[model samples]
Target: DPEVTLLLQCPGGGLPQEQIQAELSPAHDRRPLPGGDEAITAIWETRLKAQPWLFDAPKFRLHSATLAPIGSRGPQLLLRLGLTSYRDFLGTNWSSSAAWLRQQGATDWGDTQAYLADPLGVGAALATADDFLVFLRRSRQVAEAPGLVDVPGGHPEPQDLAGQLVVHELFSSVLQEICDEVNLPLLTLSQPLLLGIARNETSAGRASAEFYVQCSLTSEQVRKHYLSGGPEAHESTGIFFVETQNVRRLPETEMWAELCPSAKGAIILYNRVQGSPTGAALGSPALLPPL
Candidate 1:
């Protein structure tokens, strides 16, 4: 099946050169241009650039029966036709192009709505959870890598007295990690909320760990963490408030895949938070009623 490939070079997004190479390869096809010259074609001759609106002066007319009363008003009739075309053309070009692309492909790729489980089977439903207790750096910042980025995370080695996940002790371990990294007391904080799990297939023919946990804090709490010299920890380089909208638009490696149940769950929770009574001022409601 032919695939419509879009080549986008975003300088600020930290896009990799390897990704661009893979996108332009023969594995996919260059989809045809939709909406022809009638869809706002740009004409560049010499140094001049002209952007002409589609259907600018197409020779067409309204229904003859409706225009009969206006009788032989040629110029006025043509003007009326242009106005009608402009109204009809609004927002129709993109949809038409998408439809054309679908027709070209033997398979349906346009507007394809797919669930990971539906395509990959029940195995995709599997997930685990982990919390990334991020510590924001203060004076000792990693100059090379600043701003929002994914810091490496993993279970501590067995010999390491501090880094162990004893099955049911997941929450405890998470709290410990947070405290060790940022000197925050787990007990003083609210109960842990499960963000979701990320499932990964490893090269050794085994599925890698898949889990994520997330916590929310009020402005006061955030200030406390900042002032406590918690960011001095090596685990996190800096503390910054990243808007969730920007997070959703993060690059593939930076942002969790939609396939990751954890990411999906987080997005859902985030949406719920924004839509609830507090209107993004409070966390989403718990699935179970409060005791």
Candidate 2:
């Protein structure tokens, strides 16, 4: 069996400054939705009015990667990444396609595009102990994807960058998010292993990259030490653990339907790392399927 190893490398020792500067440019593609222009306008206006905090929130350009599968060998899996960032790749702007879709009177249009235009990169950790995985149910206070079962993670901030490549920076950011979200020190858990990256895309063309990490911690230790949260109390409503054995026994459809797309992808990748039968069945496409 091949072993999974971390691959953190970049050209010029780090991402070039120009790449960071380039992110301010408009996106190449505009994600379209199924709604008509009138409906989309109404939805956009309502969202804008409701989320007043977003208007003034500072945004930054950060590097991210999309994971691709490279075949599997026993418990070891090989994967690679296609480097990208919100500035260069995300289809966040309202485009002609969006306008056309609206004009076409698409009925199924939702707030997906609005979420994508200014997509934030998130880092999620799949903390596993002897037999189970830990998950957090997001609180309604969160602006996006509320009431969803997710891993301990959040978006990358400017502080996470230590002049490293996207992968290393993301790793560091996830570590911090875990610590801040769970109120645990970094050293309490074993070093995290990069499992894979999942690019979550909504039908409206809004997308973000979620980096998954396999953490070394048992469910008991996590609950005892981390759940006494001071910060995450605002972000997560509940913490739960699921046995790994039971995960493997569940059908893919059932598993997929339970959690958010990114969280489901993280669990599937973690299962693959643990040599679970369901992992093989669930990880077929490698990258996250459309949400």
Candidate 3:
């Protein structure tokens, strides 16, 4: 689990309706980097100064995730979220402080990474009705593997409304990412299966909730949607459709080298959980139709 850690999983096909529970806890709150890296502020300031368009928006940083037994229900995935910013993640990278925090945490905080900003990111392992998974040819604008492929995912937004029904945001916001980045309607998709969380080694163990979502549209129909341009279409330059079963073997192919860490992590989650259409069960099977 060096690259990706399975914090929570849909052990059987998926969680039962209303079986997935959430709560906001102060214990999971984002702790500041021990020294409070002034270097971070400098990094964000100059990076924003450099890009000028980058927005330092609010995001729900994932402090911890656990699947605990619930009354009458089998088990539930409970998440703890704290307020964080894109700027905090900036220093949590390979920057001098990122390394500093981890060492300092184990020194006193008990948790090895207690002091690092664990921004909770969302990754979707989306499949069209035709049993094909969707991928994006990320724009060259990204810092890592710019032109490489990635699963459609993003950090959940923390803005506007108070955090009521907040735990649902981790599941719902990813669908919004699919809509904004892939031009899909919210109603066409099923409720996300909490496949579990994946962490990025390079980004100082940044965590992402990777979910499996089945789409009502087919790959062909999705192609047209991609061409139509979603609100954040600039996030990607192209779309790819991979046969569902074949994705299991993708990690062994030469093309695997072309996948970004998030994409690779998602494919691993899909395989590890055995949640494909032909080979396995799905989360919220009620939301999907008979295959």
Best by lDDT: 3
**lDDT of every model, 2 decimals:** 0.28, 0.46, 0.74
Give the Å shift of residue 169 in candidate 3.
1.8
The TM-score of predicted model 3 comes to 0.84
Choose 1 or 3, whichever is better by TM-score: 3
Cα lDDT tens digits, model 1, 191-291, are 33322222222110111111233345543565466457743444664443444434333334334431233223333333332222333334344522232
Question: What is the alpha-carbon lDDT of model 3 when measured against the actual structure?
Answer: 0.74
Per-prediction TM-score, please? 0.30, 0.55, 0.84
Query: Top model by TM-score, which number?
Result: 3
lDDT of 1 at 284: 42
lDDT value, residue 84 of candidate 1: 18
By lDDT, is 1 or 3 better?
3
TM-score of 2: 0.55
Model 2 lDDT per residue over 1-291, tens place: 011122222222122222321222233223433332354455545656876553322233322332223342222221122222332222233333544443343334342233233334454545465757667777766645667777776655443132235435555776787777666667765545555444453323322333434456677777766656555353677677877656554335454455765665555555454433244555565532432
**Quality of model 2 by C-alpha lDDT:** 0.46
- Output the lDDT of residue 67, model 3: 75
lDDT for 114 in candidate 3 is 81
The predicted structure with the larger TM-score, 1 or 2, is 2
